[PDB]
Amino acid sequence: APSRANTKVIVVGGGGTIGSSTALHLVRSGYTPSNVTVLDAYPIPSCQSAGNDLNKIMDADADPAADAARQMWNEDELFKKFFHNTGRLDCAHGEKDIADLKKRYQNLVDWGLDATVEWLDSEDEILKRMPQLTRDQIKGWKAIFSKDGGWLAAAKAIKAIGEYLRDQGVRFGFYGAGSFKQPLLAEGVCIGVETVDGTRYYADKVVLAAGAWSPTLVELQEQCVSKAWVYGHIQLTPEEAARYKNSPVVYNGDVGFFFEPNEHGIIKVCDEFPGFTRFKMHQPFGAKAPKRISVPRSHCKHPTDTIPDASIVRIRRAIATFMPQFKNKPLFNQAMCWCTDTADGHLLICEHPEWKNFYLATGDSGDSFKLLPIIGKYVVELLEGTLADELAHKWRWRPGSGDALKSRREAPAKDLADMPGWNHD
Ligand SMILES: *Cc1cc2c(cc1C)nc1c(=O)[nH]c(=O)nc-1n2C[C@H](O)[C@H](O)[C@H](O)COP(=O)(O)OP(=O)(O)OC[C@H]1O[C@@H](n2cnc3c(N)ncnc32)[C@H](O)[C@@H]1O
């Protein structure tokens, strides 16, 4: 077995979140960069990566991995400039949701010494934090304001990792040269990969970090089920955008959520719902015949696609609620953004059970962008046999462990076949 410095690694989906983090940690840990090969369907930051976004939410999760990531977002010189510590305002209306919000302000006294949070008990209190909100729209609302957290400039952070890797001498292959087709196997050991154009790459270890594409590329036995979420954007004038500078992330689980305008004056608005599948017949490597599997419908591959009409209605309601003064702005650059759910919502980070030296690093479950800085550390630990037992178990190979179509969400995802308005072919 080669020394670390002579060990060759291929990261499939290295243009995305987990895959770029993995490449970075291989470099940071003392792998020789020219021994590391990033393969992606699209150049880093991949156009179709779920991390290719103006913004994501950084919450205040107590989990050890999330806390390790939060520290890096605050202190790591590669990542720090992309974390915007604006705070988050979580709003609720009606006795059911206000009951759950109250409960939750008590999970935080209990679980993680509060004082990093405020209860807001009236319209007046919320308006003091977020004065751009409309009083009559928030009649009867309560909120929790969390001081830590905020948002992450997601595309820029992956792009910064790519620039770092390029400058270190990491090898890249994109498009036909980067699109995984199959592993190369010799006597049950993975010795590299082949891409759709027939290019072969040989390495000691292969990481499959293909996000929502992972269950399309190899047979995962429904451990992961791929689903899309949706957003649109509105353009503010400089004067309008100035009013929202450093605004918290604003969220109401019955409505949706929105972010501070970017440096171009654009606000992204998002729905809140259990995701959409797009089932069709497909044959991953290792499947003996085609199967009905949820296969991403990639906005990058089909840039005339939008989102479902149902999704537009929901986003419009979010704008009518949160920003009634902007109800006439067109919602543009509507897109679907793919992730893959496990049954329990934990990652799938494990060696393949039959293909030695092939490792899965997926199962993102819609909440892993905030792990970008840290997650490749764990992947490297997996490759090196040093991953903590609890995590090796939590992230294990586990077909038959529950229905990922519902996962731990409120309902089984609906399918795009049944949701008109996104396909303009
Ligand atoms: C879609 C979404 C996700 C999301 C979010 C809102 C939306 C609409 N809000 C979040 C938030 O507020 N906070 C948070 O922490 N996360 C949030 N997310 C989730 C997050 O985006 C995802 O969990 C995470 O980014 C997933 O990362 P992963 O690395 O698993 O997936 P990826 O970034 O999409 O990268 C996969 C890459 O694989 C490449 N690919 C695909 N096919 C191939 C082949 N054949 N060969 C090689 N590479 C391939 C893709 O191109 C992509 O780069």
CB 211 less than 6 A from any atom of ligand 1 = yes
Give residue 177 CA to ligand 1 midpoint distance, Å.
Answer: 20
SS (H, E, C) the chain: CCCHHHCCEEEECCCCHHHHHHHHHHHHCCCCHHHEEEEECCCCCCCCCCCCCCCEEECCCCCHHHHHHHHHHHHCCCCHHHEECCCEEEEECHHHHHHHHHHHHHHHHHCCCCCCEEEECCHHHHHHHCCCCCCHHHCCCEEEEECCCEEECHHHHHHHHHHHHHHHCCEEEEHHHCCEEEEEEECCEEEEEEECCCCEEECCEEEECCHHHHHHHECCCCCCEEEEEEEEEEECCHHHHHCCCCCCEEEECCCEEECCCCCCCEEEEECCCCCEECEEEECCECCCCCEEEECCCCCCCCCCCCCCHHHHHHHHHHHHHHCHHHCCCCCEEEEEEEEEECCCCCCEEEECCCCECEEEEECCCCCCHHHHHHHHHHHHHHHHCCCCHHHHHHCCCCCCCCCCCCCCCCCCCEEHHHCCCCCCC
| 91: in domain | no
| 243: in domain | no
The answer to whether the CB of 206 falls within 8 A of the CB of 192 is yes
For 157, what's the count of Cα atoms within 13 Å in the CB-facing half-sphere? Answer: 32
| 47: in domain | yes
Q: Which amino acid, 244?
A: Y
| 291: in domain | no
Q: How many CB atoms lie within 10 A of CB 267?
A: 25
| 334: in domain | no
How far is it, in rounded angstroms, from Cα 407 to Cα 177?
Answer: 34
How far is it, in rounded angstroms, from Cα 164 to Cα 38?
Answer: 13
| 376: in domain | yes
| 285: in domain | no
Strands 276-277 and 414-415: parallel
Given the CA of residue 270, which atom of ligand 1 is nearest to it?
A: 8
CATH code, domain carrying 377: 3.50.50.60
Give residue 194 CA to ligand 1 midpoint distance, Å.
Answer: 22
Give residue 234 CA to ligand 1 midpoint distance, Å.
Answer: 23
Per the structure, the count of domains in the chain is: 1
- The method of structure determination was X-ray
| 184: in domain | yes
How far is it, in rounded angstroms, from Cα 87 to Cα 98?
Answer: 20
To test the pocket of ligand 1, the residue of 56, 61, 315 to mutate (highest count of ligand atoms within 8 Å of its CB) is 56
Structure tokens given for 104: 């939750």
Range of the domain at 11: 1-84+149-209+344-397
How far is it, in rounded angstroms, from Cα 369 to Cα 19?
Answer: 12
Given the CA of residue 55, which atom of ligand 1 is nearest to it?
A: 12
Give residue 402 CA to ligand 1 midpoint distance, Å.
Answer: 22
Give residue 10 CA to ligand 1 midpoint distance, Å.
Answer: 18
